Design a binder for this molecule. Structure first.
Ligand code: HEM
Length: 399
């Protein structure tokens, strides 16, 4: 059994193993860092099955849960939030914060999302690039999602820049372990003060709704409100930054699709759909243990065995998406959902928000900067390390 996680074939590519597995051994065992085995599921139909089967559990205290690193094993000891819950606990807690993220709520947030993108783009223009390239990640891909989720949580405008930097430090490849852990606990300490403040005087933000609707009636405690707020911050922010940067690189890589998007910004939603299929920035979250025996394809997954369902692989499944390794914004979509945001009851709470942020970015960026260019050769883009989820660390641009 091969070691898992697998490394990407190159900067912008999935691991090479998945295509071969889909063709010749779609449900197979892999070896995790601790020597334990897990079942790896690679076909779209089977990933959806894993995502939805009530015979499977997300609870990390079940033996056989496929932790992929030493750090994950240690994080499993903590009081879980809804990301690691099964029904009925899962929706009992998730429903406390889903209102801000519904399709209708996100449609009403569109003018705010647009303003945030417009202001950061105008910022960038004022900075200018007269003295040379600027980093699109630091100047734009990082602050767009950061400012939005912090604002929705309740952070005031003057604190956004500092906290945006600190949250980046938590996941920056270059941070030492100490630096990332200090940033982590710093964010937590900050959120704990906001919860104290919003309990005494609520405002129009997610933390206030938690305080008023859940903490004060005793449904959860202050510490739970902090952890829920924290989960909303850290679960998706790095994914958003990576998807923005990857989208700019992808357009540069396929000039006539960029030309189409510039000529017709109304194409941004379909560009974003293709982007979230082709670049599956979160490929390791659909994990389970079997509560009881379950058959998947030609395999028996026994009780207390772990399962990893690769949505990245599913998004390249030739049986579902014709010419899956082709980036095509004009893709003819099948009835089966792309799985960039997962599937089933745990499907990304923020899927609609994330797509709206991305659509806003890709319908505005090249109207603002029609001559935006990556300022290094595309082959020299600094991607995340190959043993991680796909992403971009920094992206020099001119405009
Ligand atoms: C493009 C950006 C994003 C991508 C690709 C992404 C992807 C995902 C995926 C693959 C999952 C796993 C879903 C499953 O278990 O089937 C997930 C879960 C989740 N995401 Fe996102 N996400 C993004 C942005 C966000 C944002 C902006 C937030 C918060 C504001 C967020 C919050 C969450 C939460 C809380 C979960 C756990 C849901 C649950 O288990 O019930 N995500 N996301």
């Amino acid at each position: 059994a091969p070691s898992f996680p697998f490394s990407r074939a190159s900067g912008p590519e999935p691991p090479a193993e998945f295509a071969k597995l889909r063709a010749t051994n779609p449900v197979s065992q892999v070896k995790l860092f601790d020597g334990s085995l897990a079942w790896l599921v690679t076909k779209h139909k089977d990933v959806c099955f894993v995502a939805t089967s009530e015979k499977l559990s997300k609870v990390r205290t079940r033996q056989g849960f496929p932790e992929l690193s030493a750090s994950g094993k240690q994080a499993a000891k903590a009081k879980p939030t809804f990301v690691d819950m099964d029904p009925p606990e899962h929706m009992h807690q998730r429903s406390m914060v889903e209102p801000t993220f519904t399709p209708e709520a996100v449609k009403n947030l569109q003018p705010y999302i647009q303003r945030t993108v417009d202001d950061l783009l105008e910022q960038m223009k004022q900075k200018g690039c007269a003295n040379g390239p600027v980093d699109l990640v630091k100047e734009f891909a990082l602050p767009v999602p950061s400012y939005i989720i912090y604002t929705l949580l309740g952070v005031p405008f003057n604190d956004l820049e500092y906290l945006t930097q600190q949250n980046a430090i938590r996941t920056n490849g270059s941070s030492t372990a100490r630096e990332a852990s200090a940033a982590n606990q710093e964010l937590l300490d900050y959120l704990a003060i906001l919860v104290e403040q919003r309990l005494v005087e609520p405002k129009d933000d997610i933390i206030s709704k938690l305080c008023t609707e859940q903490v004060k009636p005793g449904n959860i405690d202050k510490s739970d409100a902090v952890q829920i707020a924290f989960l909303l911050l850290v679960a998706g922010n790095a994914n958003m930054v990576n998807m923005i940067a990857l989208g700019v690189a992808t357009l540069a890589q396929h000039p006539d699709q960029l030309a189409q998007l510039k000529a017709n910004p109304s194409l941004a939603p379909q560009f974003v759909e293709e982007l979230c299929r082709y670049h599956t920035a979160s490929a390791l979250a659909i994990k389970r243990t079997a509560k009881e025996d379950v058959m998947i394809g030609d395999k028996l997954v026994r009780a207390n065995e772990g399962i990893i369902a690769s949505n990245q692989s599913a998004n390249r499944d030739e049986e579902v998406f014709e010419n899956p390794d082709e980036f095509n914004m004009n893709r003819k979509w099948p009835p089966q959902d792309p799985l960039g945001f997962g599937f089933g009851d745990h499907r990304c709470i923020a899927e609609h928000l994330a797509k709206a942020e991305l659509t806003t970015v890709f319908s505005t960026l090249y109207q603002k900067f029609p001559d935006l260019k990556v300022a290094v050769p595309l082959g020299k883009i600094n991607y995340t390390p190959l043993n991680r989820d796909v992403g971009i660390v920094d992206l020099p641009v001119i405009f």
